[PDB]
Amino acid sequence: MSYNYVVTAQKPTAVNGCVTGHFTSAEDLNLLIAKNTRLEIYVVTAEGLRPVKEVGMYGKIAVMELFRPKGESKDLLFILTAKYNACILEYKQSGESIDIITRAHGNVQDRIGRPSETGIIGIIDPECRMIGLRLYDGLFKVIPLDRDNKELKAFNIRLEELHVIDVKFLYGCQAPTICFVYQDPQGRHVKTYEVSLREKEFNKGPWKQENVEAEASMVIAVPEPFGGAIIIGQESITYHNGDKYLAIAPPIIKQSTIVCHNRVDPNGSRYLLGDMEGRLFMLLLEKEEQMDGTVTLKDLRVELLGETSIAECLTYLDNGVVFVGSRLGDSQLVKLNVDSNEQGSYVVAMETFTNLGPIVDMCVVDLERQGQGQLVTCSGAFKEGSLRIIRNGKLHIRTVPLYESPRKICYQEVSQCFGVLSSRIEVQDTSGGTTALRPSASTQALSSSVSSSKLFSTSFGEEVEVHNLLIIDQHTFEVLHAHQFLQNEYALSLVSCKLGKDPNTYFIVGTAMVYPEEAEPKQGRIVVFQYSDGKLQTVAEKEVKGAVYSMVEFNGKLLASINSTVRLYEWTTEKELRTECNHYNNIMALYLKTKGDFILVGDLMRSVLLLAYKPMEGNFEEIARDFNPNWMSAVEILDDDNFLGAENAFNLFVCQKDSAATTDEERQHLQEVGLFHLGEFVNVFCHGSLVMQSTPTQGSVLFGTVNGMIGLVTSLSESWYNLLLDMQNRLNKVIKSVGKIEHSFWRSFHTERKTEPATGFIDGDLIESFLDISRPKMQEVVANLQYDKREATADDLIKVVEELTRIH
Amino acid sequence: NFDTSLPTSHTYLGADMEEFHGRTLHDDDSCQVIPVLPQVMMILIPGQTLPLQLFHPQEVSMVRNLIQKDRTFAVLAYSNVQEREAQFGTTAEIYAYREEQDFGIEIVKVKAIGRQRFKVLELRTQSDGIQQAKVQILPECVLPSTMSAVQLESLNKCQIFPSKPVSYKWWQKYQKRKFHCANLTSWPRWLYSLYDAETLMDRIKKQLREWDENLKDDSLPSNPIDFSYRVAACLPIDDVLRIQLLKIGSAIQRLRCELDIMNKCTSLCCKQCQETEITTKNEIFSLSLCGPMAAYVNPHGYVHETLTVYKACNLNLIGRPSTEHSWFPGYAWTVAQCKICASHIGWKFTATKKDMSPQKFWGLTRSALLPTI
Numbered sequence A: 001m002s003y004n005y006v007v008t009a010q011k012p013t014a015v016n017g018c019v020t021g022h023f024t025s026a027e028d029l030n031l032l033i034a035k036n037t038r039l040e041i042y043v044v045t046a047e048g049l050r051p052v053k054e055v056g057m058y059g060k061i062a063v064m065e066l067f068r069p070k071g072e073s074k075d076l077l078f079i080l081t082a083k084y085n086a087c088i089l090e091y092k093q094s095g096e097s098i099d100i101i102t103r104a105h106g107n108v109q110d111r112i113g114r115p116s117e118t119g120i121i122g123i124i125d126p127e128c129r130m131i132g133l134r135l136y137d138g139l140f141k142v143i144p145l146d147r148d149n150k151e152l153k154a155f156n157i158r159l160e161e162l163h164v165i166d167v168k169f170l171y172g173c174q175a176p177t178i179c180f181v182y183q184d185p186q187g188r189h190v191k192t193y194e195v196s197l198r199e200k201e202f203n204k205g206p207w208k209q210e211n212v213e214a215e216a217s218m219v220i221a222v223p224e225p226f227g228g229a230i231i232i233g234q235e236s237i238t239y240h241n242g243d244k245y246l247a248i249a250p251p252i253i254k255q256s257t258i259v260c261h262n263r264v265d266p267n268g269s270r271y272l273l274g275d276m277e278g279r280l281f282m283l284l285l286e287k288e289e290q291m292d293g294t295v296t297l298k299d300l301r302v303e304l305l306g307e308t309s310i311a312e313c314l315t316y317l318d319n320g321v322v323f324v325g326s327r328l329g330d331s332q333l334v335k336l337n338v339d340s341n342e343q344g345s346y347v348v349a350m351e352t353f354t355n356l357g358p359i360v361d362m363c364v365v366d367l368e369r370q371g372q373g374q375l376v377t378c379s380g381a382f383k384e385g386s387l388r389i390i391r392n393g394k395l396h397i398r399t400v401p402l403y404e405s406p407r408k409i410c411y412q413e414v415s416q417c418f419g420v421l422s423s424r425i426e427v428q429d430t431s432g433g434t435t436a437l438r439p440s441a442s443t444q445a446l447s448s449s450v451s452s453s454k455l456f457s458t459s460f461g462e463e464v465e466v467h468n469l470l471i472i473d474q475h476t477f478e479v480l481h482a483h484q485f486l487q488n489e490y491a492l493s494l495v496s497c498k499l500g501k502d503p504n505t506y507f508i509v510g511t512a513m514v515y516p517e518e519a520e521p522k523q524g525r526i527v528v529f530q531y532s533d534g535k536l537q538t539v540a541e542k543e544v545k546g547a548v549y550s551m552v553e554f555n556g557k558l559l560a561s562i563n564s565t566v567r568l569y570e571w572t573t574e575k576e577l578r579t580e581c582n583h584y585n586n587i588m589a590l591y592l593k594t595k596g597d598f599i600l601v602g603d604l605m606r607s608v609l610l611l612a613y614k615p616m617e618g619n620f621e622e623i624a625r626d627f628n629p630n631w632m633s634a635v636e637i638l639d640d641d642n643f644l645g646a647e648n649a650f651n652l653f654v655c656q657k658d659s660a661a662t663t664d665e666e667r668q669h670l671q672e673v674g675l676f677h678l679g680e681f682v683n684v685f686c687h688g689s690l691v692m693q694s695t696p697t698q699g700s701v702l703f704g705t706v707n708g709m710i711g712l713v714t715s716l717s718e719s720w721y722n723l724l725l726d727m728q729n730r731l732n733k734v735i736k737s738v739g740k741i742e743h744s745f746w747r748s749f750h751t752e753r754k755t756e757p758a759t760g761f762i763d764g765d766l767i768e769s770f771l772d773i774s775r776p777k778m779q780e781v782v783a784n785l786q787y788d789k790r791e792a793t794a795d796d797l798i799k800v801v802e803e804l805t806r807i808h
Numbered sequence B: 001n002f003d004t005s006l007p008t009s010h011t012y013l014g015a016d017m018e019e020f021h022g023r024t025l026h027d028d029d030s031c032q033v034i035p036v037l038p039q040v041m042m043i044l045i046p047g048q049t050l051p052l053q054l055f056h057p058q059e060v061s062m063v064r065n066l067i068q069k070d071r072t073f074a075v076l077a078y079s080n081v082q083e084r085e086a087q088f089g090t091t092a093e094i095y096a097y098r099e100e101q102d103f104g105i106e107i108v109k110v111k112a113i114g115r116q117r118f119k120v121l122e123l124r125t126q127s128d129g130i131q132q133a134k135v136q137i138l139p140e141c142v143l144p145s146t147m148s149a150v151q152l153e154s155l156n157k158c159q160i161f162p163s164k165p166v167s168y169k170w171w172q173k174y175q176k177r178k179f180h181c182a183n184l185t186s187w188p189r190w191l192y193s194l195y196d197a198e199t200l201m202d203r204i205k206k207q208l209r210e211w212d213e214n215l216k217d218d219s220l221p222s223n224p225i226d227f228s229y230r231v232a233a234c235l236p237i238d239d240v241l242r243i244q245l246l247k248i249g250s251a252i253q254r255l256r257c258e259l260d261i262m263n264k265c266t267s268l269c270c271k272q273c274q275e276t277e278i279t280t281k282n283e284i285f286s287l288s289l290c291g292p293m294a295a296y297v298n299p300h301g302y303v304h305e306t307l308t309v310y311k312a313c314n315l316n317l318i319g320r321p322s323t324e325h326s327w328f329p330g331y332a333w334t335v336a337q338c339k340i341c342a343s344h345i346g347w348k349f350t351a352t353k354k355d356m357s358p359q360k361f362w363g364l365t366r367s368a369l370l371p372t373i
């Protein structure tokens, strides 16, 4: 009984995969980028990147590779999704038409098994003979590579090692050989196996087992003529080739942890390494020729190339040009110079690409005072933090760097400013204290202040988080004011409202007092600041026993959640908070939403409660509840009877209050009414719209995710819902998806333990794409359609779809 | 210096027993009807043992029929003893059986263990003096790690940790590295750790370690479900708390509730008095692998639960040492009664002559005890 509609306003931006090779032609250098569900294909040229193609897949891309079987002019792309749909695709271009041909496809799911903690792993034989996969612990799946395997049938092999840290293939071996590093009670080791397709089994590898560092994580398969493998851990780098064994411990690596790598020269004479803190190293392999025998290694070196964005994947294109794909910030295209600048870095920034994600909080405002709204979001983390202003013009985006992690944001019209909660990383000093790592917005405020309440009365090299409240102008986006909180304090909630008869507007902040020894908070604060004449004042404060997990302004009073308790304070004329109502529950009220006199309480375990406030008695009475063990990210209220939430496995669910029930038992239960598989990790919900203000849709809710995607959700009516469902069925029947994946399976509610078809949600992306097809396909889709009644020609469908698309 | 594996075997009821090997796991959420014992006022938790001596014709016939078909029956936790109603119960699988004759009366010795929970959906009275309840098997939900849903891979190579050394710094490092992706969400790291199975288990074990000082990591199970059931079995609370812990369907929620109960309870007192200091939390200490509380059966026929403690007040002792069917091999015992209510409370035990062991032992029954949180 939901009748909802969900569409995507901004496509995801975070890049999770990148590869390079000859894909579109035998002589063109191609770069392929995978951003969640989107695939982009560029042709590298002298000046930069020229976009060539862009497509979408009905799933999340977990593995991507390029390989050229014998007798192939170009390469083929092997792709695997998060639901274990696998496919092999080819690039076909005839004249002015570009499309990807599905050479093969299949599903490689297993009936039973617990997925490995380390996640999906996929590799390909350098000889292009088979594909190896690691999905569930204790098993290793193998897919033969033959022209007669259009169904992609694979078989499993047993691994006696349960916890396999990493695995890779090896070069220059007569039979397929795999080297992998695993762990057991004794420690971590590296072992090699030979894969026998004929017998479908394992055989003793070329060289025996060996012991490695206690933190080895990276395995690199050096090509010919060196052969062997390289193990990269926390404090050492080693090279194994059977009898030959070499090792080095570069001190300049102890600070960060290598997480990405890539190969520069074809013969494996150099490599690029990327750590967690936006650093880029160049690893070199020296070569020595002895007599008339295959060259051998002599030594290893690491040189600090420089600094870039926090890198998730690296790729060397040409002429010392490197693509750095990142998830916490903007992607980059940089250059390498033989010489060094004065500072000493060999990297020269060339080009940048925006990345909204991750989105941790947002608000909708109207800076121009028109009817057209604008969206302000807190994007990125660490030195990549910033504010993003999005306005409809394609979307127009403006970025304001901060150099620290923002967490919250709110708007206050009267003062014409934004209040932002933020945090920065500081390192303990020798004398005992804190020192910042770099200039940031928190430390560069025109005016500064430090909280001084005294209401409550370590080691070297440790890291701490310093929280701050930043008052930012709304025209120039410059940091007007900064206020620091007490040491060891945490900020959780932020609001701006007016209380009681007081005509002023305050910032009300909730904070918790956390200590490493204690496991749960036991003391927190609510602070009321007033920002006037460019200065911030601590108007009032109240100390509570617990941790304020949320706050919402409730018809002139303040509603707060303290541990497993809900409290309602009023605002007397003496500028103070006096507790007015209390209510005790059995869960922590992490999520708190309000609507008229109804309050929605939500817990991290997907427990939902619906309460009401009794004005005549001034007490809280429980109205409804619903409990179902699962992970929940956010909740929202659509109307007086419908509620929306984001659940584990990247799912959306919609519950309804059964007010039509006859007996109390039914009246006090919330019936689930809608399920959907969004494919994104929803992080924040908000009410508003980006288009300037009879319509076929009522209301609108925007949601922001972790990959930088932005989505919109609206309501509908029964007739429109049925019409759209029929249209979607017909379109799925007609159109074809890349990889030959069934759309319904893609939008099926997945939870790793149960699966159900999507209900109550009308996918909007398919309807929108309805317009990009040729006329004959539209006629085929519209054939035998009953629309208000008549034959329902394609013109009616086109008009209705245009009406829908107009909403964004 | 007293063996902790002796009382667990229940050697008192018998030495040689016809052990039955094999398991029959009922399909989840299915609907099945099973016989119910007539006289049972004990709430059974999965993974706990239960002996029983039976001498009634209809009950003995029921057991004889059952001992060959599946060896499974049902136990109903009664919310109210007077009115025999219940909404939740536990399936019990029998793993022992013996027969005896006492000059013309058949006596059956049975040992079983709980397997699964359920919500009763109907009950009927067969024309044999017993009852049969049709019920649906409840589900056992286990959730993946909270951080697995945040992203897909990110840094999966760092999600596996070195073996825990045989610790504060280790725990801090574990929290810092395991939940590193928490910065991509709207909640801090400690908030996520508050819903982590391993941290909850470690806190539970640390809380319990005061009671037993020789406790071994192998002494308590490793799986969250087994650990939760074991902890819930051996806590000194009234039947309402046990029913509440039974209703919970998720391991994490059960662990959180158990930790809350542990941190709330302070002391116990006579049920009839409602105000009589008999013992505090610290005094609790176990002498068996199962824990301070375990199941036993009087040769008279009634089965009484008892715990282990080393201090009692407001008690009057009555009787002299005896050893005829005592559950532990080698010990004296004398009845005790409330000083004010005069009601029987427990049994005072004196160690045996052999070598030496705790001379004064107090073993009470939860029926006459109630916490004072």
Ligand SMILES: Cn1nc([C@H]2CCC(=O)NC2=O)c2ccc(NC3CCNCC3)cc21
Pocket (backbone or CB within 6 Å): B297, B298, B299, B300, B324, B325, B326, B327, B328, B333, B347
């Ligand atoms: C009432 N009551 N309680 C017990 C407890 C005491 C503590 C224990 O370790 N186990 C128990 O069984 C007990 C044991 C034996 C008899 N025996 C009588 C009936 C059979 N004929 C001989 C007299 C009665 C008994």
Ligand SMILES: [Zn+2]
Pocket (backbone or CB within 6 Å): B270, B271, B272, B273, B274, B276, B338, B339, B340, B341, B342
């Ligand atoms: Zn008493």
